[PDB]
Amino acid sequence: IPEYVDWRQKGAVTPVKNQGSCGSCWAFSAVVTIEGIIKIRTGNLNEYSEQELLDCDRRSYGCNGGYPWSALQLVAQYGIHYRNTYPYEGVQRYCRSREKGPYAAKTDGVRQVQPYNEGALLYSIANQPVSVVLEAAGKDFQLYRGGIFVGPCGNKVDHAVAAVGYGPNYILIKNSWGTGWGENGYIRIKRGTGNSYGVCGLYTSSFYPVKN
Ligand SMILES: *[C@@H](C(=O)O)[C@H](O)C(=O)N[C@H](C(=O)NCCCCCCCCN)C1CCC1
Numbered sequence: 001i002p003e004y005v006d007w008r009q010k011g012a013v014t015p016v017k018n019q020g021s022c023g024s025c026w027a028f029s030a031v032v033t034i035e036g037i038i039k040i041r042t043g044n045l046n047e048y049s050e051q052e053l054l055d056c057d058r059r060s061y062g063c064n065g066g067y068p069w070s071a072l073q074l075v076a077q078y079g080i081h082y083r084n085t086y087p088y089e090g091v092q093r094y095c096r097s098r099e100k101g102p103y104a105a106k107t108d109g110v111r112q113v114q115p116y117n118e119g120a121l122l123y124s125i126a127n128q129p130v131s132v133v134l135e136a137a138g139k140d141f142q143l144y145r146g147g148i149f150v151g152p153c154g155n156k157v158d159h160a161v162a163a164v165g166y167g168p169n170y171i172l173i174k175n176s177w178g179t180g181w182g183e184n185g186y187i188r189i190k191r192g193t194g195n196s197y198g199v200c201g202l203y204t205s206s207f208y209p210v211k212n
Pocket residue numbers: 019022023024025026061064065066067068133134157158159160
């Protein structure tokens with residue numbers, strides 16, 4: 001795998017989104033990973049519906065949080081609509097996949113990165129954007145403006161985001177807090193520290209969709 005990956009330069013990342021007050025990051029993270037794999041496999045970059053996963057992933061809990069794994073499972077079993085067909089409302093509503101016509105994309109499964117393993121996560125990022133989780137509750141993360149973020153932070157992960165690249169000393173993260181946070185909505189999180197958990201618990205729980 002190469003020294004640098006940046007799926008934005010490969011045209012596999014849609015504009016940065018803002019989840020708002022809703023605890024929907026699991027759905028934003030999942031959607032980032034779907035947009036990426038659909039671009040990688042088909043050549044087209046589309047925006048997909050965070051709201052659809054928010055409303056319809058019954059394993060998750062709407063705005064009270066949820067599981068990127070169950071959102072990708074939902075997209076592999078049923079599918080997902082384009083974001084324009086099923087736009088983001090920042091509140092859980094009743095599942096409207098039925099009333100919105102045929103799905104726009106569907107995957108073939110979901111796989112987990114071997115947790116607590118930096119090379120395994122980098123290996124997945126080299127192939128596609130990956131849904132990852134981290135501890136975002138710390139003020140240092142909340143107030144991050146730029147640079148390679150080293151913390152302080154613990155490993156009490158509470159926020160799902162998407163890894164879309166890496167470099168020798170960092171992993172490149174698409175956050176869902178709008179384009180005004182961090183590095184135009186991205187954060188570079190230090191890697192290579194030898195901490196099995198990752199900076200901010202970054203290696204705790206990582207999933208990506210599989211699409212043949
Ligand atoms: C992330 C965000 O900031 O939007 C969001 O809080 C989230 O999904 N986090 C998530 C999580 O904690 N999931 C489980 C939530 C279940 C609670 C709801 C029902 C009440 C239970 N007492 C995980 C992925 C990131 C950490």
